[PDB]
């Protein structure tokens, strides 16, 4: 017989009841094969998130175009925007795509962003690079600032928390990539910074985790997803996501945390 998937649903419906809006989760147990998924393939945006898989996505270029990664990106004031802390620094010499690339996984930064995006032809190149293997649901539409909009009823921009998971278990411990390249991928989610409080807050200290955060700051949206390694353990890929339907409701990193120890600890 399999899971009472209503018993694994009613805690993720009570935290969403106190919260205003919507959580959507997917689980997978890469040793058992347990998942637990919650709204999983309702839409959600995907802010900053879209900044792991464009790590991907530059990584899977540098295969077929040696040193991609130690070549220098030296850029003017234009490719700057709020948000960007680590390429604002650099203004005056440049840095190369790994350093961009980093910068855009580990603090988020916009420009960063952009200027890989530029990189790949743009976000639709984004978006080929994840129907190429085999994400039918990822769109990533428009650049850094505008596709944090997160209007409610727009698809652009936006995921499923079942698709993120899927492919970032594909990138991250699938052979999707090179052996290299996805140990560099594992690597830059390892190092990431701006996920303390969000999944890294629900597992224990001593797990590796590796994750990618978005905040848009308006619709109760925000998410994270990582892989987990419990010690010994198969790992574990999850995604996160809210929305809520007021543009002044507020995101919580709690809601998230809460929601990823529900899923954590839902896995058969
Ligand atoms: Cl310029």
Redesign the pocket.
């Known amino acids: 017989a399999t899971a009472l998937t209503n018993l694994v649903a009613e805690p993720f419906a009570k935290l969403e009841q106190d919260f205003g809006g919507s959580i959507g989760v997917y689980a997978m147990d890469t040793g058992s094969g347990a998942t637990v998924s919650y709204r999983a393939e309702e839409r959600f945006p995907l802010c900053s998130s879209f900044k792991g898989f464009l790590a991907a996505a530059v990584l899977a270029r540098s295969q077929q175009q040696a040193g991609l990664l130690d070549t220098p990106i030296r ?5 700057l925007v709020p948000w960007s802390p680590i390429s604002e620094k650099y203004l005056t010499t440049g840095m190369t795509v790994a350093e961009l690339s980093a910068a855009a996984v580990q603090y988020s930064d916009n420009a960063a962003a952009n200027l890989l995006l530029k990189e790949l032809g743009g976000p639709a190149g984004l978006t080929a690079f994840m129907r190429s293997i085999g994400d039918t649901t990822f769109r990533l539409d428009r650049w850094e600032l505008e596709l944090n909009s997160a209007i409610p009823g727009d698809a652009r921009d936006t995921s499923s928390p079942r698709a993120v998971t899927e492919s970032l278990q594909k990138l991250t411990l699938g052979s999707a990539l090179a052996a290299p390249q996805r140990q560099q991928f594992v690597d830059w989610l390892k190092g990431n910074t701006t996920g303390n409080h969000r999944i890294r807050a629900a597992v224990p200290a001593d797990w590796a985790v590796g994750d990618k955060t978005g905040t848009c700051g308006v619709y109760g949206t925000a998410n994270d997803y990582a892989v987990v390694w419990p010690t010994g353990r198969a790992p574990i890929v999850l995604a996160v996501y809210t929305r809520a339907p007021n543009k002044d409701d507020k995101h919580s990193e709690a809601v998230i945390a809460a929601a990823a120890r529900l899923a954590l600890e839902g896995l058969g």
Do not use: I
């Open positions: 850029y003017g004031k234009n490719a």
